[PDB]
CSV table of N, CA and C in Angstrom, one decimal:
chain,number,residue,atom,x,y,z
W,292,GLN,N,0.9,-1.2,0.0
W,292,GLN,CA,0.0,0.0,0.0
W,292,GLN,C,0.9,1.3,0.0
W,293,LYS,N,2.1,1.2,0.5
W,293,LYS,CA,3.2,2.2,0.3
W,293,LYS,C,3.7,2.2,-1.1
W,294,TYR,N,4.0,1.0,-1.6
W,294,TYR,CA,4.5,0.7,-3.0
W,294,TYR,C,3.5,1.3,-4.0
W,295,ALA,N,2.2,0.9,-3.9
W,295,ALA,CA,1.1,1.4,-4.8
W,295,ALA,C,1.0,2.9,-4.8
W,296,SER,N,1.2,3.5,-3.6
W,296,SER,CA,1.1,5.0,-3.4
W,296,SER,C,2.2,5.8,-4.1
W,297,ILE,N,3.4,5.2,-4.2
W,297,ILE,CA,4.6,5.7,-4.8
W,297,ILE,C,4.5,5.6,-6.3
W,298,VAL,N,4.4,4.3,-6.8
W,298,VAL,CA,4.4,4.0,-8.3
W,298,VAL,C,3.1,4.4,-8.9
W,299,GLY,N,2.0,4.5,-8.2
W,299,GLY,CA,0.7,4.9,-8.7
W,299,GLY,C,-0.1,3.7,-9.3
W,300,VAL,N,-0.1,2.5,-8.7
W,300,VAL,CA,-0.9,1.4,-9.0
W,300,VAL,C,-2.1,1.4,-8.0
W,301,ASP,N,-3.2,0.7,-8.3
W,301,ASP,CA,-4.4,0.5,-7.4
W,301,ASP,C,-4.7,-1.0,-7.1
W,302,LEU,N,-5.3,-1.2,-5.9
W,302,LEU,CA,-5.5,-2.6,-5.4
W,302,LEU,C,-6.9,-2.6,-4.6
W,328,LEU,N,-40.3,-6.8,-21.7
W,328,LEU,CA,-40.7,-7.2,-20.3
W,328,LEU,C,-42.1,-6.5,-20.0
W,329,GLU,N,-42.1,-5.2,-20.0
W,329,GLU,CA,-43.3,-4.3,-19.7
W,329,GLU,C,-43.6,-3.4,-20.8
W,330,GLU,N,-43.3,-3.8,-22.1
W,330,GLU,CA,-43.7,-3.1,-23.3
W,330,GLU,C,-44.8,-3.8,-24.0
W,331,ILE,N,-45.5,-4.7,-23.3
W,331,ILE,CA,-46.7,-5.4,-23.7
W,331,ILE,C,-47.9,-4.9,-22.9
W,332,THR,N,-47.8,-4.9,-21.5
W,332,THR,CA,-48.7,-4.3,-20.6
W,332,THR,C,-49.0,-2.8,-21.0
W,333,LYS,N,-48.0,-2.1,-21.5
W,333,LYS,CA,-48.1,-0.7,-22.1
W,333,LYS,C,-49.0,-0.7,-23.3
W,334,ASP,N,-48.6,-1.6,-24.3
W,334,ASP,CA,-49.3,-1.6,-25.7
W,334,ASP,C,-50.8,-1.9,-25.6
W,335,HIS,N,-51.1,-2.7,-24.6
W,335,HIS,CA,-52.5,-3.0,-24.2
W,335,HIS,C,-53.2,-1.8,-23.7
W,336,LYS,N,-52.6,-1.2,-22.6
W,336,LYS,CA,-53.2,0.0,-22.0
W,336,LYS,C,-53.3,1.2,-23.0
W,337,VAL,N,-52.5,1.2,-24.0
W,337,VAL,CA,-52.6,2.2,-25.1
W,337,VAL,C,-53.9,1.9,-25.9
W,338,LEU,N,-54.2,0.6,-26.2
W,338,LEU,CA,-55.4,0.2,-26.9
W,338,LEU,C,-56.6,0.6,-26.1
W,339,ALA,N,-56.6,0.3,-24.8
W,339,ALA,CA,-57.7,0.6,-23.9
W,339,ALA,C,-58.0,2.1,-23.9
H,292,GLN,N,-2.0,-36.8,-29.4
H,292,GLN,CA,-2.7,-36.6,-30.6
H,292,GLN,C,-2.4,-37.7,-31.7
H,293,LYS,N,-1.1,-38.2,-31.6
H,293,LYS,CA,-0.8,-39.5,-32.4
H,293,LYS,C,-1.5,-40.7,-31.8
H,294,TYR,N,-1.4,-40.8,-30.4
H,294,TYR,CA,-2.1,-41.9,-29.7
H,294,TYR,C,-3.6,-42.0,-30.0
H,295,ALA,N,-4.3,-40.9,-29.8
H,295,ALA,CA,-5.7,-40.7,-30.1
H,295,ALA,C,-6.1,-41.1,-31.6
H,296,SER,N,-5.2,-40.8,-32.5
H,296,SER,CA,-5.3,-41.0,-34.0
H,296,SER,C,-5.2,-42.5,-34.3
H,297,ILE,N,-4.4,-43.2,-33.5
H,297,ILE,CA,-4.2,-44.7,-33.7
H,297,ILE,C,-5.3,-45.5,-33.0
H,298,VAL,N,-5.5,-45.3,-31.7
H,298,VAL,CA,-6.5,-46.0,-30.9
H,298,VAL,C,-8.0,-45.6,-31.3
H,299,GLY,N,-8.2,-44.4,-31.7
H,299,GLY,CA,-9.5,-43.8,-32.2
H,299,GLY,C,-10.3,-43.2,-31.0
H,300,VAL,N,-9.6,-42.5,-30.1
H,300,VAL,CA,-10.2,-41.6,-29.0
H,300,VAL,C,-10.2,-40.2,-29.6
H,301,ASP,N,-11.0,-39.3,-28.9
H,301,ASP,CA,-11.2,-37.9,-29.2
H,301,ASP,C,-10.9,-37.0,-28.0
H,302,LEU,N,-10.3,-35.8,-28.2
H,302,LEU,CA,-9.9,-34.8,-27.2
H,302,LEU,C,-10.2,-33.4,-27.7
H,328,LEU,N,-44.1,-17.5,-22.7
H,328,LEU,CA,-43.3,-16.2,-22.8
H,328,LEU,C,-44.0,-15.2,-23.7
H,329,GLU,N,-44.3,-15.6,-25.0
H,329,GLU,CA,-45.0,-14.8,-26.1
H,329,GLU,C,-46.2,-15.6,-26.6
H,330,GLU,N,-46.8,-16.4,-25.8
H,330,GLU,CA,-48.1,-17.1,-26.1
H,330,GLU,C,-49.2,-16.4,-25.3
H,331,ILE,N,-49.0,-15.2,-24.8
H,331,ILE,CA,-50.0,-14.3,-24.1
H,331,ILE,C,-50.2,-13.1,-25.1
H,332,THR,N,-49.2,-12.4,-25.5
H,332,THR,CA,-49.2,-11.3,-26.6
H,332,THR,C,-50.0,-11.9,-27.8
H,333,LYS,N,-49.7,-13.1,-28.2
H,333,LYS,CA,-50.5,-13.8,-29.3
H,333,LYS,C,-52.0,-13.9,-29.0
H,334,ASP,N,-52.4,-14.4,-27.8
H,334,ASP,CA,-53.8,-14.8,-27.4
H,334,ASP,C,-54.6,-13.5,-27.4
H,335,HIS,N,-54.0,-12.4,-26.9
H,335,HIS,CA,-54.6,-11.0,-27.0
H,335,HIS,C,-54.9,-10.6,-28.4
H,336,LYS,N,-53.8,-10.6,-29.3
H,336,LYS,CA,-53.9,-10.2,-30.7
H,336,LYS,C,-54.9,-11.1,-31.5
H,337,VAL,N,-55.1,-12.3,-31.0
H,337,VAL,CA,-56.2,-13.2,-31.6
H,337,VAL,C,-57.5,-12.6,-31.2
H,338,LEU,N,-57.7,-12.1,-30.0
H,338,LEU,CA,-59.0,-11.5,-29.6
H,338,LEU,C,-59.2,-10.3,-30.4
H,339,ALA,N,-58.2,-9.4,-30.5
H,339,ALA,CA,-58.4,-8.1,-31.2
H,339,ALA,C,-58.8,-8.4,-32.6
């Protein structure tokens, strides 16, 4: 974690709709 | 792969329908 800090590494519902449109 | 070659081994939408039928 000192090393990493120095080098800079890190460690469906379109049918229910279409019906309700008709209604 | 020589051995294998000698011995012969190897190495949903029936609801959207039913509505459109009604319509």
